[PDB]
Design a protein around this ligand. Structure first.
Ligand SMILES: C/C=C(\C)CC/C=C(\C)CC/C=C(\C)CC/C(C)=C/CC/C(C)=C/CC/C(C)=C/C
Ligand SMILES: Nc1ncnc2c1ncn2[C@@H]1O[C@H](COP(=O)(O)OP(=O)(O)O)[C@@H](O)[C@H]1O
Ligand SMILES: Nc1ncnc2c1ncn2[C@@H]1O[C@H](COP(=O)(O)OP(=O)(O)O)[C@@H](O)[C@H]1O
Lengths: 1033, 132, 528
């Protein structure tokens, strides 16, 4: 067969079963080939355009195409300049989505195929599918790279940028996903899907710096991604990666992400961990189940009700529809990943399930459903029954996305297109080539990470450069680097505000957020001058944390470690260590000189650095040319300000309570007799409330005297005042919100609120202004000094989660109020008889070392009362605690009741799977009402014991509800009785002795609990079991 | 797919039926309108046909602005013969002899075998007629 | 160069049917051969006939530092080359090239087979650093034993490193091969320009492979029929061919090849180093098949096939139609650049004169059909053909010394006997003014060429003729019978005026590049 004949076979299939359906007007392809539905889904059209483009990539290998390369390529442009049209008409929504990404502000993902108008509303359909905006951008890059000219003018480039500003913040926007439903439950709920974040990581890796004009392109046509927002997407995908979401431990939507088209994952071990779960738990004879417990077009599904009701998801176990398309993705993955026997294994699986149209053209049925009469037989022996196709093609129904993937897979498998041809941007990087790919891999490779960050020590004044030189550090003042301009990050945020600004489409520009450490680590050419930005770590702030130099030195180490772990761009990162004369004042000089000296030695924190002159460091380096600034409307270039040389009590005696019951002008009386900046903050902070923002003070408006006392004790390092001041003036840091996203991107949930007081749970990314109400009004209403300390711990924990993620393993809900409690207790145990120091008097850095010390793996040594109080307060769980609690719930008919909460076997067993993250949160909610933290550790231990008894002994099963509190009370009462027999302790209902008893030992806590559990289990039937049938019975 | 139904039936004059057509790889030549329209008395008179042919040639000589040289296919039917049938109409002979002489109908005419005229004709290709 | 390497490829040269210098070429660093069958035909002969235990013989019958070689005499005398058969020095470096070839070509067992062969032959310096001996020679006492049973004797190293002697080329190749083999450098890293193209990737690499691939060759050359005058475009349209006059393509400038040769003469001109520029040769059919941006204007060049010439071959239209077919077939076989080739078929009013019209119209018509000689073509308007095409930007022209840009002329619209009776021999024995007598009584342009060609010799370049200088009357008779297609005269004229074609020399290189040798000279007479 000639190539013409080999490829005329695909052109007949493409032209009949795909390009016949392309809208003559929009270019979008219709979801229903035959019918009056006017729905064109965004994802299915992209996969359809990719299928026509794959045939053009094949016809490019024939010079006498007879027009077929132009038509098949221009069909792909038609579909892609049709999705752009649908989005460009909804650009009122792209502006709203950048500012407020939400389910009801999104670009619609289903449009009228004929007109491009919105078809289904936000109520009718879940349009927040960022897999679609993100695959539009991956495919636009992959097609524009191929030679296909989809973007035509600067306004289309500005919309693609605004589309990018939206795809950057996906980590914080939960969505419905490729499957349009959200989770397995169709509750109408959006969740973060590895698949949507993974496609966004891939669109962003591909579109950073892509001339969207292609070869006919200049600097003003390039798209610019935020290295920091891309990192946040990489961080989210990797903390959800053997899995898909809180609901799905595996989904087959992971296969489109992990491999064609995105090829997103950059870890070969996670790719194998993710693929193996997808193949093992989702593969079928007729295809791959979209997700386990899936009700799509299942026989048992109710057609009329859109939303599955709780526990319905069980009815779909074994009846799950199997989509033959996933066999085609596995064949494309095999061609790309060089497995010539995974293409065959899955080709062999598809040849049987493939229907053929009347003319012989193959039809990939969308799904294969178990017929209703056979549902119970499949559920009984899954894989036994025969499932009917959903579309046979002769019916007039074709799955246009699957038809397109057949063309891509068959062409790739037959070697009529090459992996390189359909991945012009190299999304698949073979392992041997995983070395210098920007935003993904660094020269060192995939595994090695010893980056040398290029430090440049910049001094605020010549005075400070001459002072620093005398003490050993050569630094350069801002002027000594004359052509180079050192800018605050905020001045780049002002410049970027002019990127993507189209007034014709109502678009505004980069949202005004902070550029971070992976974007201030780049050299920029803005308006003809070279700009290097000082990191956000060096940005002055109202919060009192800035005053501790030790925290600055640590933020410098923490930033450089983030730059090492997460900078994968071509140049060496450039960290500029701005030194301000305030930083060396007093004894801050000795700590700063050691940091500055280590930066000179070449290592600060395990991060190798090369301090050198900026001119030498900026010399052959890649500079991001910010060409969007232009002159624009104003005939003047924007005005950008650059850092310039700055040329020259033991305890508060006044207690709040005894001095607030007084309303007296006498608080204003002691105010004149208080030298304590802590008594003043307490006295001049009672009055920011009772007398008002401006009640006149001797000094002046009260608002001015607390800000004077806060600032004054900030310098005098009087930390009780700085915290009473910050709280009384209700100070919140810019970084609380950026850090609370580290918790969220890492799968952790932060609770703010004190121990013993109203807690709140930030489970989803939130605005600085919503987070502020949660800390000063909603949660801490009794002491606001707690909000400043909790704000202090979120900043500390957030960098600890980023650089040392495992100091927080076994922690899923990080209760900052409980962690502060662990710290107040550590100060008492450390204190001894001598009174314990007040966490509040401790310096921001002393509060960080207390945290780091309490988080350190409890080692052999401390009282088992102290080990328990710290572990219980940190809410640390033994590894597999959550999996083990599933196993206890599976073998307990009526559930577990702890502290007046109840994990019932149903609806949880029916709606959830063993490793579901949703279950870990339900176990954590059940143990929520345990007020005492040492009791939480005993309850965590009873549950660990109940798991060993149940697992070691497979015959015993609980009859009634297990009341974990009663099993604990019976264990303490046995201990109480046995210890009484030793020495008759007269303390009653005091579990201090029980808590101090080691877990395992001669008579430890684990014996009492095993005994209690066994007495309960043995009071019920012992099921004869077959694994080790009884010998004496 | 978009409910478009070809081209409306329009009578092709001498200009349309003067090019050669490549339909399914075999060349199709089409006689002028006035020959196949034998439903009114005009076709019975051979002089009329001569006059229609002269008008067609005069129109062609002036209105042909196409690549190629136009080709009028003129078949002599049995109705074009005389009463006996062993002789051709005088008018039709005279017209054919004038065309052989190079001039008829205000137009310069080259007569010859249709096979010779392939290389210098408006051999348009009708790709919509191919099957499939 | 591609044609020469291919003609000579299984082999190295007239003398060597295999040499191990082919291994550096066929594979690292050049990776030159683009045929997988010749690579295997070339490598297999090199490995089979040149491999050894201690290395690869540079070539069979090699006398380098052989025991039997005379040190004093630089030049081996005839038949000495036999004395070196089996004594040939074996260079361990070729094992390192075979290991680099294996890393590049994905054979993880050719790296091992040749690593295993090198670990024994590798000496080590005092500090343990490996020394790749340049050659391993058979010691003189053992030469006859090796010649008797080749591969039996033990050959001493040439440099052991401890000696203070190191083969710096081999030392460097150890680092390249060892790093490549240990995967401390990648094949991509040391071949940034992709000289090795894996088979599956042998598709769109310029000057080497074309979209169609390594094996398929149905190129569609992009023909553009350009007519000398509007008169000829209107004439050609009436007869079926739409052509475009040079003016109708206004921004695009159609240049003779010679005008590109003038432009290129300014490439590489350095007066500081005394350099001059491209040598003034003809650009050919693979360089006139490109669209050029010269001094801000788009220039497409008519092929050298359409260049007017004194030689009489130009007059036969059938030869022009064949040169057009021959050129397009060369463009198909040997154009491997990204764009479709652009052949511009300049049609001159002389080409359609007389019965040349019927042959030219059939070529022009086949060019319109899309096939002329098995070469598919797409005739179209130059503006459409030049539109998204890659243009070679000739930026070296600049302004240079002169503050004026060079002056380049572009093709512009040209706006409006049965036998010679006089035999040479019987009419050359005569010295008479009578040859000048018959000259007035010869209507034969062949009798005139014979009569007015005897006199370009005996009377001189300007012996006065009735007509004028004889040199002018033979050039008038040659030109006249060239048109009247009187070919005996055109050949007596060309010969008598001693006419040679520009193409004789370019073609005699086809013979030479193809391994053929041309002999000129008659049969029965002095050959050369
Ligand atoms: C980190 C924590 C641990 C290592 C757990 C420590 C283990 C403890 C305290 C003991 C755990 C004991 C368990 C799980 C169970 C014991 C057995 C053997 C129970 C037998 C019950 C029974 C009546 C079985 C029937 C026997 C048959 C089948 C007879 C024919
Ligand atoms: N005060 C800060 N300290 C550290 N990093 C910050 C700070 N402010 C912003 N960033 C970083 O800047 C980038 C974008 O800022 P922002 O939109 O505030 O992020 P987020 O939404 O994740 O809080 C993120 O990488 C974020 O971590
Ligand atoms: N008059 C000509 N006829 C045919 N081919 C020619 C002519 N002049 C040059 N060429 C071709 O142009 C290319 C380069 O020209 P030139 O340098 O003259 O070649 P060469 O050195 O082989 O004679 C060669 O392929 C050559 O054959």
């Amino acid at each position: 067969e000639t190539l013409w004949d080999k490829l005329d076979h695909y052109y007949r299939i493409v032209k009949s079963t795909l390009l016949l359906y392309q809208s003559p007007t929009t270019g979008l392809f219709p979801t229903k080939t035959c019918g009056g539905d006017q729905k064109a889904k965004i994802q299915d059209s992209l996969y359809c355009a990719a299928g026509a483009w794959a045939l053009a990539l094949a016809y490019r290998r024939i010079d006498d195409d007879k027009g077929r390369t132009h038509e098949l390529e221009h069909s792909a442009i038609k579909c892609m300049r049709g999705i752009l049209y649908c989005y460009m008409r909804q650009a009122d929504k792209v502006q709203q989505f950048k500012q407020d990404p939400r389910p009801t502000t999104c670009l619609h993902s289903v449009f009228n195929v004929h007109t491009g108008d919105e078809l289904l509303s936000y109520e009718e359909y879940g349009h927040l599918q960022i897999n679609a905006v993100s695959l539009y951008l991956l495919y636009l890059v992959e097609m524009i790279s191929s030679g296909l000219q989809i973007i035509y003018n600067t306004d289309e480039v500005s919309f693609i940028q605004n589309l990018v500003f939206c795809v950057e913040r996906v980590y914080r926007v939960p969505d419905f996903g490729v499957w349009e439903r959200g989770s397995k439950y169709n509750n109408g709920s959006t969740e973060l899907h590895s698949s949507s974040v993974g496609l966004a990581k891939a669109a962003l890796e591909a579109i950073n710096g892509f001339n969207l004009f292609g070869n006919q392109g200049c600097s003003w046509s390039v798209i610019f991604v935020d290295l920091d927002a891309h990192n946040r997407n990489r961080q989210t995908l990797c903390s959800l990666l053997p899995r898909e979401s809180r609901s799905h431990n595996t989904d087959a939507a992971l296969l489109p992400c992990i491999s064609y088209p995105a090829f997103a994952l950059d870890d070969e071990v996670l790719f194998s961990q993710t693929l193996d779960k997808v193949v093992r738990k989702l593969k079928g004879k007729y295809g791959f189940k979209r997700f386990l417990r899936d009700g799509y077009r299942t026989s048992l599904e109710d057609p009329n009700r859109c939303y599955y009701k709780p526990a319905e998801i069980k009815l779909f176990d074994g009846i799950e529809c199997e989509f033959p398309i996933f066999f085609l993705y596995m064949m494309i993955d095999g061609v790309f990943r060089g497995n010539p026997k995974q293409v065959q294994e899955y080709q062999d699986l598809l040849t049987p399930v493939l229907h053929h149209t009347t003319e012989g053209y193959p039809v990939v049925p969308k799904y294969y459903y178990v017929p209703a009469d056979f549902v119970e037989y499949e559920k009984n022996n899954p894989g036994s029954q025969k499932r009917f196709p959903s579309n046979c093609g002769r019916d007039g129904k074709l799955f246009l996305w699957g038809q397109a993937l057949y063309i891509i897979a068959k062409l790739l498998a037959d070697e009529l297109i090459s992996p390189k041809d359909i991945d012009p941007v190299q999304r698949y990087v073979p392992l041997k080539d995983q070395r210098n790919v920007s935003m993904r891999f660094s020269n060192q490779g995939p595994l090695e990470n010893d980056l040398v960050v290029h430090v440049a020590l910049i001094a605020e004044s010549q005075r400070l450069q001459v002072f620093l030189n005398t003490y050993g550090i050569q630094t350069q003042t801002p002027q000594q680097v004359e052509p180079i301009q050192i800018w605050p990050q905020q001045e780049l945020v002002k410049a970027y505000l002019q990127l993507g600004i189209n007034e014709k489409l109502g678009l505004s520009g980069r949202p005004d957020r902070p550029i971070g450490c992976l974007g201030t680590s780049k050299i920029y050419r803005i308006l003809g001058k070279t700009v290097v930005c000082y990191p956000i770590i060096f940005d002055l702030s109202d919060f009192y944390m800035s005053q501790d130099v030790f925290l600055l030195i640590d933020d410098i180490k923490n930033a450089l470690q983030f730059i090492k772990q997460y900078w994968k761009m071509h140049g060496r990162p450039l960290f500029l260590v701005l030194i301000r004369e305030d930083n060396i004042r007093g004894s801050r000089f000795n700590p700063i000189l050691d940091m500055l000296a280590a930066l000179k030695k070449g290592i600060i924190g395990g991060v190798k650095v090369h301090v050198d002159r900026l001119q030498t460091l900026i010399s052959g380096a890649v500079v991001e040319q910010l060409d969007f600034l232009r002159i624009s409307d104003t005939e003047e270039l924007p005005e950008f300000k650059s850092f310039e040389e700055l040329e020259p009590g033991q305890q508060p005696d006044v207690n709040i309570s005894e001095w607030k019951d007084k309303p007296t002008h006498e608080i204003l009386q002691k105010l004149n007799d208080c030298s304590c900046l802590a008594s003043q903050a307490i006295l001049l902070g009672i009055l920011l409330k009772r007398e008002g923002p401006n009640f006149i003070t001797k000094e002046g408006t009260v608002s001015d005297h607390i800000e004077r006392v806060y600032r004054r004790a900030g310098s005098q390092k009087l930390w009780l005042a700085v915290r009473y001041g910050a709280a009384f003036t209700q100070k919140f840091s810019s970084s609380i919100a950026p850090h609370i996203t580290t918790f969220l991107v890492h799968g952790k949930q932060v609770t703010l609120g004190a121990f013993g007081h109203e807690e709140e749970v930030i489970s989803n990314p939130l605005s600085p202004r919503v987070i502020q109400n949660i800390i000063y009004y909603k949660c801490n209403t009794h002491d606001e000094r707690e909000a400043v300390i909790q704000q202090e711990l979120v900043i500390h924990i957030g960098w600890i989660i980023s650089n040392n993620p495992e100091l927080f393993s076994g922690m899923l809900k990080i209760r900052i109020g409980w962690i502060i409690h662990a710290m107040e207790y550590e100060l008492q145990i450390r204190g001894g008889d001598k009174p314990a120091l007040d966490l509040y008097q401790l310096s921001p850095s002393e509060v960080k070392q207390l945290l780091l010390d309490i988080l350190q793996p409890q080692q052999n040594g401390r009282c088992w009362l102290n080990r328990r109080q710290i572990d219980g307060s940190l809410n640390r769980t033994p590894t597999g605690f959550y999996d083990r609690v599933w196993q206890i719930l599976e073998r307990t008919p009526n559930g577990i009741i702890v502290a007046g909460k109840h994990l019932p076997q149903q609806p949880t067993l029916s709606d959830m799977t063993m490793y579901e993250m949703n279950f870990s949160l339900l176990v954590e909610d059940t143990l929520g009402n345990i007020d005492q933290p040492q009791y939480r550790q005993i309850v965590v231990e009873l549950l660990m014991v109940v798991s060993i008894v149940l697992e070691r002994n497979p015959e015993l099963e609980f009859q009634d509800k297990v009341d974990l509190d009663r099993l604990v009370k019976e264990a303490f009462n046995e201990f109480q009785k046995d210890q009484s027999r030793l020495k008759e302790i007269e303390k009653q209902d005091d579990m201090t002795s029980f808590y101090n008893t080691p877990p395992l030992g001669k008579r430890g806590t684990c014996s009492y609990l095993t005994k209690a559990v066994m007495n309960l289990l043995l009071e019920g039937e012992v099921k004869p079991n077959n694994d080790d049938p009884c010998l004496i019975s | 797919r978009m409910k478009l139904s070809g081209r409306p039936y329009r009578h092709m004059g001498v200009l349309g039926t003067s090019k050669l057509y490549d339909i399914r790889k075999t060349i199709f030549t089409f006689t002028p309108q006035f020959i196949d329209q034998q439903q009114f008395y005009l076709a019975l008179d051979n002089k009329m046909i001569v006059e229609m042919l002269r008008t067609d040639l005069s129109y062609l000589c002036s209105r042909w602005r196409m690549t190629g040289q136009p080709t009028i296919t003129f078949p002599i039917s049995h109705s074009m013969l005389d009463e006996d049938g062993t002789s051709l109409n005088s008018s039709i002979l005279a017209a054919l002899r004038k065309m052989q002489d190079g001039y008829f109908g205000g137009a310069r005419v080259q007569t010859g075998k249709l096979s010779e005229f392939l290389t210098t004709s408006c051999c348009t290709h009708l790709s919509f007629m191919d099957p499939g």
